[PDB]
Amino acid sequence: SNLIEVFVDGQSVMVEPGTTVLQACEKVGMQIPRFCYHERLSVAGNCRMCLVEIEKAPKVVAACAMPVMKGWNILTNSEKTKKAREGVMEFLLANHPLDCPICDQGGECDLQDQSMMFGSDRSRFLEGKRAVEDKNIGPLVKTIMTRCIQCTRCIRFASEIAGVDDLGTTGRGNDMQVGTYIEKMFMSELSGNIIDICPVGALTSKPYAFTARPWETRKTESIDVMDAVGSNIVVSTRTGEVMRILPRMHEDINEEWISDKTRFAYDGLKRQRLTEPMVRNEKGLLTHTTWEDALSRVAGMLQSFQGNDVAAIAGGLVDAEALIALKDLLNRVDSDTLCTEEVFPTAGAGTDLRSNYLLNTTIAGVEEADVVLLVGTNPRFEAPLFNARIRKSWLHNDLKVALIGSPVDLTYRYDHLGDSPKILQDIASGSHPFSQVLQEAKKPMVILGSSALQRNDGAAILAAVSNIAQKIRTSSGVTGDWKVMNILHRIASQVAALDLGYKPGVEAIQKNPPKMLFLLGADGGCITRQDLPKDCFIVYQGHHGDVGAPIADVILPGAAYTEKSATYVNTEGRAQQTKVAVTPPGLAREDWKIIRALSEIAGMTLPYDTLDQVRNRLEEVSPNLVRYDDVEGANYFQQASELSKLVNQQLLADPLVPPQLTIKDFYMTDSISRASQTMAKCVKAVTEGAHAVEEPSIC
């Protein structure tokens, strides 16, 4: 149609107008050398390493920035092209420090690799070299800025992805220095990602400093559970230890970024771990025992008690395989009190319909939206990668964003409608000026955070926000399949638990207090020992000792997300499976195997012994939990609204205050993160500065 024709070394490729020489060479399989160009950042054209000859043209052009013109023949392997690369590399390495042995970027450095492939084998630089001061920008990123090649990728990322304009260039010429000029910390929910984009060792990870080398690490592709975005990751393991977390590219979720918590919270998996089964002795203190004894004590009470006397609570980092396993075990004693720690309104159609509790528009849908209304949520901290997607559309598609909550810093300017929930009624009635915007918007998007649903008036907010979506969606302006209502979850286990049939919240456990309680990773303190029948036999299964373990009568160690192959469902509803990178530490075991073993001890043996058999059971309870990396559409939104209108509850006067308001609340939200010492240094930094957290950095 509008495609033009260009030639790359004589081979024809049809490219859309506006395409660059670079992008054209990709379609024939050639990767132009690069140091400054990044496909997800703005073009800069400053490294000059992409220079490529166009036949019948006397000047080399920067492929990263020059659009192709019809008829151009691109000579990627010509002498002029090859000599341009050698010259540029020679300038890059002239003042570069001889630090490869002491530089953590060794073995995964683009300057090293591109020197070998596109550069000379020797130097003709007989002069002295430049040296630069080191700059402290926090406890997560180490700066050895003498290694900087002035590519300005960090400057562009902070401005164009993180929304923070704290990195820049000071001076000019050979003395031009990237930094903050002042002593400042580049603290953000996406700070760590400047480490990856920096092609050299100028920016490196402080926690990972000196621990390993790229070639000696085994790469395991798993998923992140610190949030509900389900960011795809790579777990680098050496000799049965976890060394670092790296992003794995998924276009429709995390692109190629991860949050700092995902990146730097892996070190809490090496502290405060549960390694051996524990039971209470006569004195009343937990003592180490064996799986045989501990499982026998637990099974005896399970046989004795029955019905509502048996209950369970699921935490934030629980896998679907264990959730269904526990459900079956408690069902076989005729107990349906399967509960979570995260509230979701049970009024109306509750969890009967998926659409009622999913981000139906998908993460990628935000790019196609025209208006976004955020209610009772700080997406910057509840879902760092989801906010980054909003800011992208804000920047490239000129999206309009409105918020009904406390005025927070989302890294992009937004229209603050107010904080009281009552504004949601006005937006429906039409009084509020923003009502016309949603009505004039072809593809509006309404997002309610699960944080706001934890309020005692949560069911009212959901129906009000649902009512808004119905009106504009029903009006012919909205398209055939655009889905306007969305719920943004902050917990990784919630969606799977809701899909599987768990009751959201611990309300049912306070209506009918249980005499036996299974705490399956529940460290949020929702239910304590002041809310249960005295003499409760509590069983805590998990990987960390935080809040649930010290109150339990039996402790059954379990694996973490790095140690098991488990299914997690994101806020979209997409199911993704982790993979084993290391194995469970001491006498710890896989979560679903502990329950399966317990069932056999108790006589209620479950019908699965392998992972592939418990995943078949997941299909029976919900076929979507085995379709990995596929988003399954949910419909029947009108049916859900009709049911919601019936009850009519009353909104409270309390303003919507998000649980997390500043960065300091971001870093510690779960057991793994609370154990981490790196997330403890981050918290100390954003509360006092680098006055004390600053550390020597010599190499």
Partner 1 sequence: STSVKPIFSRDMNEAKRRVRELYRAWYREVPNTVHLFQLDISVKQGRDKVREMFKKNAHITDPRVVDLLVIKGKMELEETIKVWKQRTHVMRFFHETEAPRPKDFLSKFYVGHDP
Partner 2 sequence: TRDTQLITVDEKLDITTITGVPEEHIKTRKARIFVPARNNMQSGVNNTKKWKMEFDTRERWENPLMGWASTADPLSNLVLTFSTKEDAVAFAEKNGWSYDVEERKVPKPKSKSYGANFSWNKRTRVSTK
Partner 3 sequence: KLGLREIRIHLCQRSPGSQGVRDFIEKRYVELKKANPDLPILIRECSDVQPKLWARYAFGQEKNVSLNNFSADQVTRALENVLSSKA
Binding residues for [2Fe-2S] cluster: 36, 47, 50, 64
Tokens of 690: 């680098």
Segment 170 to 199, residues that bind K ion, using CB under 5 A: 198
187, β-bridge pairs: none
On the CB side of 362, CA atoms within 13 Å amount to: 16
> Taking CB under 6 A as the rule, does residue 160 contact ligand SF4?
no
55-94 residues near partner 2, rule: CB under 8 A: 64-65
Member of 6, 8, 34, 320 binding partner 2 (CB under 8 A): 34
User: Which of 491, 532, 457, 21 is closest to 229 using CA atoms?
Assistant: 491
Distance CA 374, CA 403 (A): 5
**Binding site for [4Fe-4S] cluster: which residues?**
96, 100, 103, 109, 148, 151, 154, 198
Q: Tell me which of partner 3, ligand SF4, partner 1, none is bound by residue 302, counting a contact when its beta carbon lies within the kind-specific cut-off of 5 to 8 angstroms.
A: none
Told to check if 679 binds K ion by CB under 5 A, we report no
Query: Cα(699)–Cα(696) distance, rounded to whole angstroms?
Result: 9
Under rule CB under 8 A, residue 475 binds partner 1: no
CA separation for the pair 374, 52 (Å, rounded): 47
**H helix runs in 164-310, sequence order:** 193-197, 260-264, 291-304
Burial tier of 80 (Cβ tally within 10 Å: 0-12, 13-18, 19+): middle
Interface stretch with partner 3, choices 253-261, 348-356, 398-406, 557-565 (CB under 8 A): 348-356
In the stretch 608-627, what mask flags binding to partner 3 with x, by CB under 8 A?
------------xxxxx--x
Amino acid at 413: R
Q: Does 199 bind partner 1 (CB under 8 A)?
A: no
Output the six-digit token pair for 322.
């264990």
Q: In sequence order, which residues have a C-beta less than 8 Å from that of residue 240 and are 6 or more positions away? A: 582, 583
The phi and psi torsions of 25 (rounded to 5 degrees) equal: -65, -25
The 234-273 site mask, x for binding partner 1 (CB under 8 A), equals ----------------------------------------
What character string, x for contact with partner 1 (CB under 8 A) and - otherwise, covers 331-360? ------------------------------
Over the window 161 to 200, marking each residue x when it contacts ligand SF4 by CB under 6 A and - when it does not, the resulting string is: -----------------x------------------xx-x
Query: Using CA atoms, how far apart are residues 225 and 230, in angstroms rounded to an integer?
Result: 6
- Name the residue nearer to partner 1 (CB basis): 148 or 614: 614
Q: At its nearest, how many Å lie between ligand FES and the CB of residue 23?
A: 12
Interaction residues for partner 3, span 321-340 (CB under 8 A): 328, 331-334, 336
Applying CB under 8 A, among 583, 616, 635, 677 the residue interacting with partner 1 is 583
Residue 581 contacts partner 2 per CB under 8 A:
yes
Pick from 81, 95, 152, 622 the residue near ligand SF4 by CB under 6 A.
152
d(CA 699, CA 102): 6
Residue 190, C-beta contacts closer than 8 angstroms, at least 6 positions apart: 161, 162, 257, 259, 260, 384, 388
DSSP line for 512-563 = S--SEEEEES--S-SS-TTSS-TT-EEEEEESB-SSSGGG-SEEEEB--TTS
DSSP class of residue 350 equals T
Cβ–Cβ under 8 Å, residues 640 and 348: yes
Query: Considering only 48-56, 272-280, 345-353, 517-525, which stretch makes contact with partner 3 by CB under 8 A?
Result: 345-353
HSE-CB at 247 with a 13 A cutoff on CA atoms is 21
Residue 120 is encoded by which pair of tokens?
């000379």
By the rule CB under 6 A, 201 interacts with ligand SF4: yes
10 binds, among ligand SF4, ligand FES, K ion, none (CB under 5 to 8 A by kind): none
632 binds, among ligand SF4, ligand FES, partner 3, none (CB under 5 to 8 A by kind): partner 3
Choose the one of K ion, ligand FES, partner 1, none that binds residue 46, judging by a C-beta under 5 to 8 angstroms depending on kind.
ligand FES
Other C-beta atoms within 10 Å of 2: how many?
6
Containing 120, the helix (H) or strand (E) segment is none
Q: Report the alpha-carbon distance of residue 178 to residue 167 in Å, rounded.
A: 7
Q: How many CB atoms lie within 10 A of CB 382?
A: 25
One residue of 77, 120, 129, 214 binding partner 2 per CB under 8 A: 214
Told to check if 250 binds partner 2 by CB under 8 A, we report yes
The window from 196-204, 229-237, 376-384, 597-605 that contacts partner 1 (CB under 8 A) reads 597-605
Site string for ligand SF4, 103-142 (x = CB under 6 A): x-xx--x-xx------------------------------
CB of 134 to partner 1, least distance (A): 44
One-letter amino acid for residue 344 of the chain:
F
Contact positions toward partner 2, by CB under 8 A? 18, 20, 22-23, 31, 34, 38-40, 42-46, 64-65, 105, 108-110, 113, 152, 155-156, 159-160, 165, 168-169, 195-196, 199, 214, 219-221, 234, 239-240, 246-251, 256, 394-396, 398, 565, 579-583, 612, 628-629
Binding region for K ion (CB under 5 A): 198, 203
The residues of the shown chain that bind partner 1, judged by CB under 8 A, are 290-292, 583-584, 589-590, 593, 596-597, 600-601, 609-611
